[PDB]
RNA sequence: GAUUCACGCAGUGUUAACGUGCAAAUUACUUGUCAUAUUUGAGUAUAGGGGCGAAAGACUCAUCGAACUAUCUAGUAGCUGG
RNA sequence: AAGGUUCCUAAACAACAUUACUUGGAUUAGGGUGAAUCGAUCCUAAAUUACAGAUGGAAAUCCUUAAGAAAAGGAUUGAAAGGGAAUAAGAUUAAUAGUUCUUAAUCAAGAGAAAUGGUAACAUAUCAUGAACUUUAAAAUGGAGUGUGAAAAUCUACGGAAGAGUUCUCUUUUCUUCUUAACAAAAGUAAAUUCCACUGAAAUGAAUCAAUCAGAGAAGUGGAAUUUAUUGGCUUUGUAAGAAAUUCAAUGAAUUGUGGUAUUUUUGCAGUCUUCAUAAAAAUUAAAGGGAAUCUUUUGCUCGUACUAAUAACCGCAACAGGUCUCCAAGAAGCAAAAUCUUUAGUUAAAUAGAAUAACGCAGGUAAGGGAAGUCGGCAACAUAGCUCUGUAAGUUAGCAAGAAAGAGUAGCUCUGGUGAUUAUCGAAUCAGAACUUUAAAGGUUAGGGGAAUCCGACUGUUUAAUAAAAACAUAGCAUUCUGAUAAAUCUAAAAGGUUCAUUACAGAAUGUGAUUUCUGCCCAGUGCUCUG
RNA sequence: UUUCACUCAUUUCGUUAAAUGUUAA
């Protein structure tokens, strides 16, 4: 009963959706995003996640205030 | 919804400024004077005929009366 | 649910507005390639993971 | 190997004590000078069953004596006392039981229970249901005095260390011969998480040092150093002697 | 045998979710939400519950007549008509007492 | 009812003659009242273990725990009087 | 922590059905059990040479005699295929 | 909870729902979710996280009131099932309704020397002053089983009103409706418990189904209080008949008694039993001790509210025979919430049909004579089966074995007697007995095969989710070892760090054997362990 | 170096850091 049974139960949610990042990462019973890395201040990036840096980094946003400086 | 029990306190009543509208109601056997005021619904109920005249005389002019009887207004 | 946050059920209304298809004068266009729009999914289909 | 189930015990996760309908901290009022040179008196409220524990708790209830208003306490229950007794505390009370004097003033032969091993930390030594401590001598040079404790074992302490004269309530307790495997699950309702004891035998290579083969047997000896490491160390440690005693 | 439904948002039957099905016009059953039962006041000494007060929640009682909350008596309210009497005597007694065996006796 | 297992025919047939009849002392010593020490009627009864409860007396009172005085607690009550009163004379 | 029936639950047997199945473990009858060492929801705690285990190396998201995932990494192959 | 527009309407059927579709939970386009009273918001539970401090090479870890010039006292979060101020009936929409409309209320925050009565228990439309400080109580606390009050549902007696069915054979017949909220009032009148006054019990009484109680005071008489799903429990009353239900007519008219010594459910109450188990806290409220001081009207903010809640809206790739927490609950029959049939409600479609009626299959069956001769093995099937009376062995831990084993009875119709209440009537199913009859009667469904031994485990219990449920694990019992608590075990890199420990030898920690009975023999050379040498 | 006596770092605790020590009385 490992298979199609016990999938029944499922329906409580683990990770909703995170303040900082906008994605379904934020863990509820462990009060931190596995993604954005959140309230630690710094984001969270790792080397091994070249990949996860490529995907949310700077370059990636409207860059509202940041492309009239270089710009200028 | 309170209940008056005899005469001396709904003529106190009525002539008390404090009446807002008042529903005579003529049913099979008795009448109901439900007096509405500020906040209660009070009644009182009658099975004489002549008794309940005595009531509409006292009536102020300045007042609304509503009759209501076995069929609905 | 019944119960939901504030910020929860517009982030739900939203998805029901983005759950529309191309109007007609768009795909009139000259040179216009967007007939359909390929971010639709429907309750059935496909949870939207949120 | 894994970590053996005494090692996973030092982390508290689930061998927490399930202390969450007990009645608090029972031990002697803090020292003062009212304790010191002079008695002050409780009133017994009530008598009371404290889970985890095998002795009632008594709920007594000092006047404040630098302020107004009371000053509750939680003794454990002398065997003997009632409720709406009064128990003096000081160094001039009466030696009653259930009284708490320092242990410099009881006579030779007296029992006392709740010593202090130490003066002003309100309660050690003789705690348990039905146990007792005896004086056993005074010493005027050092203002020290030997009790005996209830393992058999002698002590020298101060002679300020408060007691409770008599014996602690709740006597025979393990007299009575558990029956059922259900009663012995109920009796750690406020206790660890320790009851059903898989023997190490039965386990495998990996969870115990005696994990063992074709045949449940140890193959090694159960007697072992105090100095040997957590995980290997099992069965009887520092054992001076082993088997039955004629 | 008309069957009803809870009318709130509570679907489990707990202390607090006490219903009780009342009939209205036309044979119509409906749903009312009963209160919890609640103890009264203990004289402090014996525990003993004391007469004269009703067994309502603590907030019903601001509800309730200053003069139906407590008996017009010394520690009315808070001791019964026994726990009281014993209280006179001890500290009648007790005072008596001691007036004559201190203070040249 | 029984011939020799009187309370104990709870149990059945299911713990052992000897350990059925070792708790025989206990249960019916746990569940018997006794005198009050202080209104002398036969109305104290057991409410845990270590507690007794006089019920028309009005009184708690510490004991053992199955019975209301035990011989250790008895035999200590008498010394620290032999005790005290010594200790007050001379 | 007695004997049984019922709502439920399990999984003794048929080593029945099915076995490119209703189903990546299900169905039917039979059997056992069906409240105190009971059944169960939610919250919460315990995390990889770690945890949890009435102890089967069992369980830890269909993954366990050491999870999943990414990097070292195009690991090395006296061996197999082209 | 999860889903997220799947809800309603209209147009439309290219694709999808193993045929087809005018159908759709599918396409297109609009519409739909209304709160002072329901919840979140407030409080704390297990637990969780900050400033300063401690630790660390480091990221970071520890501490949660201890270390602090921080917080009268202890910070943050933590429950849509725990606690919690206050709303009900009727009607309305294609869809929302304790949310809208009508009517009727309720709550909170505002505004406009200081009382009597009763012997007493105690009582008075706010009444009848009550500060700091302190205490008490409430919120707030297990389970079982027995008795009983009340309401509802079902059943039934009496008196009708209205409508419907049957009617060639009868049937004064069968069936349906005859109702009432929140909040308050007080004609009439209950059950149970606890107290108060008089008096003082033995020839001891009083009492329950059981108990249980009394000279620190019974029974008796007279009172007081509380509980009984809002005021005050039930009938009754205002609400309120004007509503609603059943009929009649073409909007208008008719009625809406009283009971029961019956069953079930709900809800309280009263004592009894049980634990080496004793079965939460805060927000918030009231009262007391104390004596400091001298009716009207206004407002009630933010958020959720549609729909499924499942053999089609959730998780399993799907319209998957799997899984997923709850509330309300009719008749027959029976011990039974069992199997079987029906009523209110829902549905007739839920991976396509028609023809023929071959073999081999899957599911359910029967059988002449024999009766396990089949087979590794009575595997599979057959057989016993309810209730009443008689009767029941060896063995035994004296409790059991035991429903041992074995034998007899059971239907229909017509009768008779027993078990009560009130002074002849009223009512309950239950037991026993007797004639007569037949197809000789538990068996439509439901419903134990039995006996004589051997081995293992003592027993109830747990186990390899998905080939092993067992003699395996656990268990109580027995036994051994260490530890005086600054300890023993033991987590951490470290730490005024952490667990047993809110603890203290009747305790903590580490092990072997496995109930009860009986017995545990000899060996200290070797290897461990230990020594006061 | 050993053996003693003290506290002054230090170890372990307790509180509302709530009468410790010495005199007068």
Redesign the pocket.
Known sequence: ??????????????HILCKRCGKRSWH????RCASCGY????MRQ???????LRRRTQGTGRMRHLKIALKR | ???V?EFKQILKLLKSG?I??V?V?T??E?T?F?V????????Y?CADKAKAEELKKAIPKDIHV?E?????? | ??????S???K??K??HQ???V?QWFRMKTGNTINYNFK??????????? | ???????????????????????????HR?????????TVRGLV?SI????????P?ARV?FR?????????ELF?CAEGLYSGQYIYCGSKASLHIGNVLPIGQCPEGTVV???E??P????????????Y?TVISHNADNETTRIR?????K?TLKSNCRAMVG??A??????????????????????????????????????????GGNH???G??????????????????????????? | ????????????????????????????????????????????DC????????????????????????????????????C?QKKILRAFLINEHNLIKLAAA | ??????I??????????????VIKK??IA??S?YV?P????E?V?????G?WEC????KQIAG???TLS?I?GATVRSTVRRLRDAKNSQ
Not at chain 3, 1 to 6: D, I
Not at chain 4, 30 to 38: G, N, T
Not at chain 4, 120 to 131: L, M
Not at chain 6, 38 to 41: V, Y
Request: include cysteine.
């Open positions: 009963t490992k298979g199609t049974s016990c999938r029944g139960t499922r329906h409580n949610k683990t509820l019973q462990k009060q309230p630690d201040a710094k790792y080397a091994w996640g070249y990949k996860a | 919804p309170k209940q029990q404090s807002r509208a529903r109601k049913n099979g008795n109901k439900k509405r005021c500020a906040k209660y619904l009070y009644t109920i509503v209501i009887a076995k069929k609905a207004p | 649910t019944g119960h939901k946050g504030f929860y059920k517009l739900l209304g998805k029901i759950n529309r298809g109007p639709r999914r429907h309750w059935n289909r496909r949870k939207m993971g949120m | 190997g894994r970590r053996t189930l005494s090692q996973r015990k030092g982390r508290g996760s689930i061998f927490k004590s399930r202390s969450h309908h007990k009645l608090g901290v029972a031990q803090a020292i003062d000078f009212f304790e010191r040179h002079s409220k009371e069953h404290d889970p985890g524990r095998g002795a708790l209830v404040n004596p630098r302020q107004y208003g009371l000053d509750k454990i229970c709740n010593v091993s130490k002003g930390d309100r309660g050690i030594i003789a705690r348990a249901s039905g146990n401590a404790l209830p393992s058999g074992a002590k014996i602690i709740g006597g025979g307790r393990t007299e009575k011969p558990i029956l059922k495997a259900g009663v012995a699950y109920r009796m750690y309702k406020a206790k660890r998480t320790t009851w059903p004891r898989v023997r190490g035998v039965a386990m495998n290579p990996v969870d115990h040092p005696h994990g449940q047997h140890v090694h000896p159960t007697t072992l150093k105090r100095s040997s490491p957590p995980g290997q160390k099992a069965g009887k440690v520092a054992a001076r002697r082993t088997g039955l005693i004629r | 045998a008309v069957r009803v439904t809870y009318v709130r948002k509570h679907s489990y039957n707990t202390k607090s979710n006490g219903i009780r099905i009342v009939k209205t016009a036309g044979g119509n059953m409906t749903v009312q939400h009963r209160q919890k039962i609640s103890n009264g006041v203990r004289c402090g525990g003993c519950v004391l007469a004269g007060i009703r067994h309502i929640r603590p907030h019903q009682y601001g509800w309730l007549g200053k003069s139906k909350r407590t008996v017009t008596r010394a520690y009315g309210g808070v001791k019964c008509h026994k009281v | 009812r029984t011939k020799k297992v009187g104990v025919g709870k149990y059945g047939t299911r713990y052992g003659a000897s350990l059925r009849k206990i249960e746990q569940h009242k009050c202080f209104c002398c009627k109305a009864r057991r409410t845990a273990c507690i019920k028309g007396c009005k053992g725990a199955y035990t250790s």
